[PDB]
Amino acid sequence: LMKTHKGTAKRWRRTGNTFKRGIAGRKHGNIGWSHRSLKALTGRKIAHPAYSKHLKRLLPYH
Template identity: 65%
Template sequence: MFFNSIVGLGSRSAFASFGGFNSSSLVFTRNLMKTHKGTAKRWKKTADGFKRGKAGRNHGNVGWSRRSLKVLSGKTPAHESHIQRLRRLLPY
């Protein structure tokens, strides 16, 4: 306060006005991309792309043959038409 009265700035500081901008316009923000949590629980990022578990194996499989259940086990890679959307949903 004593420094402001000597310099003659009053209640404004020297840093509040810079080149015609007020201090609120000098706030810099980063555009952070958020991970889509629903996608993150279903898809895993690999070196070549993305992979997911196959659907249809969780319940209601009584009476199914072992061969048909074995086909539904394991992981499957993402289709090439989904890659762009998955990159946007899982940026990190």
């Protein structure tokens, strides 16, 4: 039987009929940049259709 890919499990979560994720690029080198601009690098986004199929295969039981 297939096994959940734990890396994807830790970096992705199931929401509705798709998956959520965190942002990339706000863990160092933030000083000198605009806070009102870095605001866009805080929070979550949704999976993209280009890789929805990959995610479905990587997390069979999600």
